[PDB]
Amino acid sequence: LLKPLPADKQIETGPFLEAVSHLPPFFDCLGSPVFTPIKAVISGNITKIKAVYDTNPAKFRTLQNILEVEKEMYGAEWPKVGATLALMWLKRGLRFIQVFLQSICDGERDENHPNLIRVNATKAYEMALKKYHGWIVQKIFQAALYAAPYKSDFLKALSKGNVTEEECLEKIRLFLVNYTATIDVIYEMYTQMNAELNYKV
């Protein structure tokens, strides 16, 4: 999965990229081609970070190094540049997933619609993405929501082949431990480096 955090909280770029490279395929298990463009955008972020990393894996050994090195490389253009920008967006997608999954695991629901996950996706959107989206992108989110899988198929997909919903949620809870810790460190690094931007798309 995601390997745990070292004591010094430095996140190794290579292993992080191998971990997150498992993410784009998981989109196809939301069970709708509607999500293909979102898959492609997240893949694009990962590809951009990988392209920078590959130029000098020692110089870009950790995610912290990416921000440090690029700040120096790009001056006034930073942080709206390079792998710093790609990771700024990637982390927002990762945080959306974190909040979404955590919300489902925490029993958050619409009483009247137990085999949907609309309410969980809406909370994740508000906490991770909405701040950076203008009116048009928000309308697109609303449209995409109609394509969201049934809770059961979604859980069946995350386990595909037969486990109970309860067993699946326990597996998701276990995954969430290192996943949340890793995302938290990435957000902290953007904050501490003043690398976070607040422009809307």
Residues lying near ligand CIS in the complex (CB under 6 A) are found at 19-20, 22-23, 26-27, 30, 33, 36-38, 41, 44-45, 48, 85-86, 89, 92-93, 96-97, 100, 117, 121, 129, 137, 140-141, 144-145, 148, 158, 201
- Rounded Cα–Cα distance for residues 188 and 201 (Å): 23
In the complex, the smallest distance separating the C-beta of residue 188 from a second copy, rounded to whole angstroms, is 26
For a second copy, give the closer residue by CB, 31 or 69: 31
| Bridge partners of residue 62, in order along the sequence | 12
How is 118-148 classified by DSSP, letter by letter?
HHHHHHHHHHHTGGG--HHHHHHHHHHHTTP
For a second copy, give the closer residue by CB, 140 or 174: 140
Q: Contacts with a second copy in 35-74 (CB under 8 A)?
A: 36-38, 40-41, 43-44
Stretch of 8-16, 143-151, 161-169, 176-184 lying at the interface with a second copy (CB under 8 A) = 143-151
Contact by Cβ (8 Å): 180, 98: yes
- Residue 98 in tokens: 């974190």
Q: Which residue in 188, 197, 194 sits closest to 95, CA to CA?
A: 188
Choose which of 119, 127, 137, 176 interacts with a second copy (CB under 8 A).
137
